[PDB]
Design a protein around this ligand. Structure first.
Ligand code: QBT
Ligand code: QBT
Ligand code: QBT
Ligand code: QBT
Ligand code: MG
Ligand code: MG
Ligand code: ZN
Ligand code: ZN
Ligand code: ZN
Ligand code: ZN
Lengths: 165, 165, 168, 168
């Protein structure tokens, strides 16, 4: 019946586009899809906790979760949904800007049927595949919502190089 | 320097979405991308022959070709571009509605650095992964432009079942 | 029931046969019966060496999973695979997609269109040692399309090394 | 120069060690020097069996490519891999991501965040023989987290078989 599919990788890797590619496939076969997004045949919702969705998710064949790393209870939610027979698809960062794991996404790795880690292109050297997200502005807040203004995806050596200067 | 990446699979598998996912990645690293589409940092063109693009493609780092199976000279074009150092990305059907290969895309398989075959979800049984495109209207024209009105993506056994009734 | 065709392609030295046997082993842990077909001129589950698939007869019907190694040597491979997958077998094929001139094996091209799954593996360039390799370069002088051998006669190369070497 | 960490995860019987050796062999065809590290309690390129990575010393610096099998047994694996990849090695690790209770090996979770590449393989469900399997079920009674063994003590299962069996 149910499964969990997980899409990880650094920023700018196209994780959300891949999540939607998959949702679309299911829609062409007349499956009902429920898309959950974060905020500080089809359906959408922006929420800050998966609790706040209630039981609405049970009306759907496929549940998609975007920015899974911002939801504190995401692993338990996905397991509950997959145990009820849903196809659960999650896009998330695996690593924060210090290359430290989001603990909840780690738990999802252990529970997932499928895991794909996408890469980006290094925004520093423009020559290599990038697996890390470097924060270009000086906060020590773990969560800090932003775009290419505040983050770059970089290859391993550019991450190091920048970490010096 | 150059490569060729090929994305294949039946209709409704999200090949064009994957092609664009990849283009977008390159754009975030400030690479210039040139997108070619068929008709009967960025740039677009609809054309019916790759000849009609001329040498415009040389101004770009990345060349993307959508619906590669409609272009008669696509293999030679891609090889020329990759030999000049371009990253060439092609989305195409590998098989026609009779499960017979597009000969030019076969040639691209042999020349590609990378090949991915995406699947769809079976639009007949809604239960299995689909690798074939079944034409639901009665032409014997190989080329016949259309959507879900005239085609379904199906699994192997649904393809057979329908081929009877 | 649910037959399928899985195809593994790529140049020589890419590990295609290893990937094939990885997949077989998975099935074997679940007690699936697996039959492995190799090519006769080529130099423990149920195994046979044949020079065409017709010489296997109907023996393949006794198995859940049929694995075909060096598929490019068999002239009737597409039809065999389709017949087996229509009978409900999982059919797994390892094959070169391209010959040493980068021209396709036509029968494998047919298989691409019939496959549920296609993976193209790469090797590491054996000329420059720096890039992924997608082509096989023949290092001995023969114009015979078929010429069985190993790293004594072939090497896998990246796109620019293939060109460079072709000038010599 | 261009170091990286490649991680192969999935449950038991998924072929992770075979995939690791597939990758090593590719590198070896391009004459890269490859070093293979196995776990000591565990039951030909340069090979060593150790119970932690610190006991390899600096021997790993003599190779282009470092392969670590059963990474979940090594307590210092993330740091070792990062140090090696920062020195320019290609580091390839095979490991269970989850234990028999479906709880993560924390050190492997760290590696996911540090890896350039992560692949999670599946097995075939050894209970129902019909579905892909992502979990390892321990078939003997031990509450020790670490318990070395094979199909004598474990089987890989799909999500519903894991549940079903857990009731017994
Ligand atoms: C690396 C990051 C990213 N972020 C943010 C930046 C973006 O708003 C978001 C990433 O979007 P993504 O999952 O890649 O579509 O998470 C953090 O809050 N903390 C970190 O350490
Ligand atoms: C299976 C097909 C499809 N087509 C068409 C239908 C669509 O216009 C197009 C597929 O779009 P795609 O590459 O999957 O984005 O090709 C044919 O002309 N002949 C065939 O035999
Ligand atoms: C590239 C090749 C390889 N071969 C042979 C050499 C080997 O015997 C066999 C290996 O292919 P494999 O990668 O094992 O499936 O194919 C040819 O006969 N003609 C060619 O053009
Ligand atoms: C699931 C396991 C497996 N193991 C052991 C059993 C095997 O010796 C080893 C195999 O893992 P592999 O798939 O080879 O990397 O890991 C545990 O010690 N604890 C568990 O919870
Ligand atoms: Mg082989
Ligand atoms: Mg192993
Ligand atoms: Zn870089
Ligand atoms: Zn179907
Ligand atoms: Zn080379
Ligand atoms: Zn099962």
């Amino acid at each position: 019946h149910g499964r969990i599919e997980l899409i990880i990788g650094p920023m700018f890797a196209g994780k959300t586009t891949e999540l939607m590619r998959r949702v679309q496939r299911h829609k062409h076969a007349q499956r009902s899809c429920y898309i959950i997004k974060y905020t500080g045949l089809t359906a959408n919702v922006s929420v800050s906790n998966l609790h706040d969705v209630g039981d609405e998710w049970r009306k759907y064949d496929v549940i998609a979760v975007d920015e899974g790393q911002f939801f504190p209870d995401v692993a338990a939610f996905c397991s509950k949904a997959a145990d009820s027979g849903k196809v659960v698809i999650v896009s998330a960062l695996d690593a924060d800007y210090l290359q430290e794991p989001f603990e909840e996404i780690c738990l999802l790795v252990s529970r997932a049927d499928s895991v794909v880690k996408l890469s980006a292109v290094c925004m520093e050297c423009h020559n290599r595949k990038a697996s890390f997200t470097y924060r270009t502005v000086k906060s020590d807040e773990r969560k800090l919502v932003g775009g290419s203004d505040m983050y770059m995806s970089v290859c391993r050596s550019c991450y190091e190089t920048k970490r010096n200067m």
